């Protein structure tokens, strides 16, 4: 309806990005810094200056980065590894403050909630880490029988959503109950892995989820009532969803056939734009701090930066 460029503003190169659906290899900091996991290194790229930094490189043969996530203030970076560590990195100092172990298998997903960092694993378990204290491992949430590939705290901290290659979506309370750590909800309707998980920024209890190749749907939920408010065939595995306040839209990333981004109007779920370019499947979307730009990372070893939510 308005002008949404059909091409990316910038195309960063992402050589040796690992073409593995379950990983979460890109994140955009409040400080305008893109973190990007390419095989066994993480690169930082300022969208302000254009400066590039190789933050770290794994030490051991065969080890690679399996997830990254910035802390809110953008000065520390969490990094999950194929060797089941959650490392914590001070980005200015360029030092590694912690190397937290607890998981039995690779750590593919990460989400922050203040000083609690939540980590998910190929084992199916989710761990809460109090990164301030010595015994970092303060909770275990066990609601998945296979890889936790989607993990996101609600903006208001009241809920944590997790998505799995067991095709489950769980919504966790922020604090255990009498039963201990048990989901408030468990949605079984997806028929494929659910890596795409995102909270509506302007509707507290509303969650969007997206399914893998055998599912292909985007689903919207009320996590209070348990209702599916909407299911849309996206015709392609859905790797990531973001919400945009700017125009009240969602954007999702896809693979085969067209490897496109699709922008949808909420709550009508009408298709606004398709953003073509990527020549292989999209792996991840992440959003800039001003909300104007989405970064897509794909298996064609590029990051495209789309100015698709510009204001006035």
């Amino acid at each position: 309806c308005r002008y949404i460029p059909s091409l990316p503003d910038r195309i960063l190169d992402a050589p040796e990005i690992r073409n593995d659906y379950y990983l979460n290899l890109v994140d955009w900091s409040s400080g305008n810094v893109l973190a990007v996991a390419l095989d066994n290194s993480v690169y930082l790229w300022s969208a302000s200056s254009g400066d590039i930094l190789q933050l770290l490189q794994m030490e051991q043969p065969g080890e690679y980065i399996s997830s990254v996530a910035w802390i809110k203030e953008g000065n520390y970076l969490a990094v999950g590894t194929s060797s089941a560590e959650v490392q914590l990195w001070d980005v200015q100092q360029q030092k590694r403050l912690r190397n937290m172990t607890s998981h039995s298998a690779r750590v593919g997903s990460l989400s922050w909630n203040s000083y609690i960092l939540s980590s998910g694993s190929r084992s199916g378990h989710i761990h809460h880490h109090d990164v301030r204290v010595a015994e970092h491992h303060v909770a275990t949430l066990s609601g998945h029988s296979q890889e936790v590939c989607g993990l996101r705290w609600a903006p208001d901290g009241r809920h944590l959503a997790s998505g799995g290659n067991d095709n489950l979506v769980n919504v966790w309370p922020s604090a255990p109950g009498e039963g201990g750590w048990v989901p408030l909800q468990t949605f079984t309707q997806h028929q494929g892995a659910v890596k795409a998980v995102a909270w509506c920024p302007w509707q507290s209890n509303v969650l969007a989820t997206g399914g893998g190749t055998s599912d292909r749907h985007i689903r919207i939920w009320n996590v209070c009532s348990g209702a599916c408010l909407s299911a849309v065939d996206a015709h392609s595995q859905v790797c990531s969803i973001l919400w945009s306040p700017h125009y009240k839209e969602l954007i999702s990333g896809h693979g085969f056939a067209q490897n496109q981004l699709v922008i949808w109007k909420y709550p009508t779920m009408a298709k606004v734009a398709e953003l073509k370019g990527h020549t292989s499947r999209v792996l991840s979307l992440t959003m800039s701090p001003d909300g104007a730009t989405v970064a897509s990372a794909a298996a064609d070893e590029t990051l495209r930066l789309w100015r698709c939510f510009e204001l006035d």
Binding site: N19, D20, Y21, Y22, Q146, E147, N165, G192, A193, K195, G212, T213, S214, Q237
Partner: peptide, 7 residues
């Protein structure tokens, strides 16, 4: 499973 990494 590598279900979502299969061709």
């Amino acid at each position: 499973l590598s279900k979502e990494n299969v061709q």
